[PDB]
Design a protein around this ligand. Structure first.
Ligand SMILES: NS(=O)(=O)c1cc2c(cc1Cl)N[C@H]([C@H]1C[C@H]3C=C[C@@H]1C3)NS2(=O)=O
Lengths: 491, 98, 49
């Protein structure tokens, strides 16, 4: 059953079309085959989108797969909601709940709100690009108003190429006026690779700055530039290279010839191509389940003008979309589920931070569950809160009256408490205030030399330091050491 | 449907309104078919040919009025259906005039 | 390698000990913030030059 479909592809989406050609024969042919008529045409001109859509409807196909631009989303929704033709896409998700659209890209916005709330920012800059749309820009302003944030949002996308070396210099020097430190980028990969190079030229990647990339292929762009900088760069991934089928596709993908499939003989892959691959899995699961339920899709006639007045559609496409919304397989993004509208739920997004060795994950974020860090505590050097022993003596070390409600190093008060804070301020270490157990100053035992008290805590390696009323004698210098004396007294 | 029907009718000059969702469809037909279109609707953003528009721009006057009232901190309630060009405009002057 | 590891901000200061100071690349650290001085024996302003 070679079933007629239609495909829309931009002039330059060569990696994506090659991944579609791979996924075409990656799994098929125990059954029905596909008849893809490919349209390597533009996406900006909605008249061209109209011509291609009426051409493929003149063909009379059952389903159309491809991309759309923000100047075409209204046209695609307006034709598909009329003519009941199910349309599937990997592009940016739509704003309104529209029928007959399945969209392969998950949400980013709740993830990005989770990331900002995890880092606990208050004031930042937001460089956005207009031509991807403004839904995230609308979403962050509401929570910025509620969560008392201070956003300086800046449009950057309409800047031409021929002034594109000094516009960024004027832009970041205006950011130097408020002395910005925290930048969220929201662009395509080309604008990211343009803006990272201009940052690394004007010298803004030292320790102190902090960058969040709002894309899905965090490692799909260049990261060898600002890897060794000093700035810290975080982003998101939906394609995790650790997994079994992922690494299988990596080995399958690397061994292909570049000449037959352009952009294929690399290690990594674009997330757009990954979703294009999973789209074939969904689309074949559809016609699989319709032969499971044995429902015939016989058109039984020709199609005609797309301008038919009034045009009348066929509701077996409604049943096609109904069976499309029930597809649940595993793919490169993980599990998939759909809503009542065609939007994706049941996804998982990995949080990816850049380190010196390279990228690494620190946690995941689900469709309902918030940010769960994976407890990756590779911090090998923790400055230990050192052991400070003392004893209760007025006014050297005294209890407070409200010690149960307070905690720890706040509970004690006196001369020695004030002194130890000065020592730790001058020396930069961490400390915890402890008490000697047996309640003594300490002397040695007869015939066994067992120093008890505050002496043996330092002799026997128990306590680390002792700021306390201790008297320099002759018999104490042999086992512990003393500084210069700080307060004189007598019997 | 209406535009294809009237160009099949052989219209010499097209006039009518548009919302935020059909603006690309009409400018994409008119740039190809070279038909003069006239409108009282909201003005566009990019310089498109064959579109005459009677509604004047606003953003310069509104920025001048904010500078005259001498403000620093305010709220801004918007609707999306007329477009978001003014919202994109006032944020840049917010970035400049702090 | 300096411009990769990020040591050309305002504060650092470099002296090139050569004769063709402009014969090498200077578009890299021109906009940095560091200050770079050197020597020339071939002056492009002159007539025969
Ligand atoms: N007047 S006092 O007892 O509180 C007192 C006693 C002393 C102080 C400082 C004070 Cl405020 N520092 C001295 C040190 C300073 C120098 C000279 C000896 C030691 C080094 N030791 S000390 O003689 O023990």
């Amino acid at each position: 059953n070679s079933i007629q479909i239609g495909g829309l592809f931009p002039r330059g989406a060569d990696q994506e079309y090659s991944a579609f050609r791979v996924g075409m024969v990656q799994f098929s042919t125990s059954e029905f085959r596909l008849t893809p008529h490919i349209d390597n045409l533009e996406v900006a001109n909605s008249f061209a989108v109209t011509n291609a859509f009426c051409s493929q409807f003149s063909r009379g196909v059952y389903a159309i797969f491809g991309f759309y631009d923000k100047k075409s989303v209204n046209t695609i929704t307006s034709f598909c909601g009329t003519l009941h033709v199910s349309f599937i896409t990997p592009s940016f998700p739509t704003d309104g709940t529209h029928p007959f659209v399945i969209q392969m890209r998950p949400d980013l916005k709740g993830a990005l709100l989770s990331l900002i709330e995890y880092y606990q920012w208050d004031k930042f800059a937001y460089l956005y690009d207009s031509d991807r749309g403004l839904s995230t820009l609308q979403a962050v302003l509401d929570s910025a108003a509620e969560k008392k944030w201070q956003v300086t949002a800046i449009n950057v996308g309409n800047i031409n190429n021929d002034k594109k070396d000094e516009t960024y210099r004027s832009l970041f020097q205006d950011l130097e006026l408020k002395k910005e430190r925290r930048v969220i980028l929201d662009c395509e990969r080309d604008k990211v690779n343009d803006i990272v190079d201009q940052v690394i030229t004007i010298g803004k990647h030292v320790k102190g700055y902090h960058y969040i990339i709002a894309n899905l292929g965090f490692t799909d762009g260049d990261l060898l530039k600002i890897q060794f900088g000093g700035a810290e760069v975080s982003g998101f991934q939906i394609v995790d290279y650790d997994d079994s089928l992922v690494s299988k596709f990596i080995e399958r993908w690397s061994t292909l010839e570049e000449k037959e499939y352009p952009g294929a003989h690399t290690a990594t892959i674009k997330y757009t191509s990954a979703l294009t691959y999973d789209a074939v899995q969904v689309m074949t699961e559809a016609f699989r389940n319709l032969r499971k339920q044995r429902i015939e899709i016989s058109r039984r006639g020709n199609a005609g003008d797309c301008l038919a007045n009034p045009a009348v559609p066929w509701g077996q496409g409604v049943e096609i979309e109904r069976a499309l919304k029930q597809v649940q397989v595993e793919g490169l993004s993980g599990n998939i589920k759909f809503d009542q509208n065609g939007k994706r739920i049941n996804y998982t997004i990995n949080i990816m931070e850049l380190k010196t060795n390279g990228p690494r994950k620190i946690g995941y974020w689900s469709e309902v569950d918030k940010m769960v860090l994976t407890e990756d505590d590779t911090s090998g050097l923790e400055q230990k809160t050192v052991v400070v022993t003392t004893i209760l003596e007025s006014p050297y070390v005294m209890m407070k009256k409200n010690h149960e409600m307070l905690e720890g190093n706040e509970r004690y008060e006196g001369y020695c408490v004030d002194l130890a804070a000065e020592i730790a301020k001058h020396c930069g270490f961490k400390y915890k205030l402890t008490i000697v157990g047996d309640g003594k100053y300490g002397a040695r035992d007869a015939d066994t030399k067992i120093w008890n008290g505050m002496v043996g805590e330092l002799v026997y390696g128990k306590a680390d330091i002792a700021i306390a009323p201790l008297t320099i004698t002759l018999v104490r210098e042999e086992v512990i050491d003393f500084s210069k004396p700080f307060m004189s007294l007598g019997i």
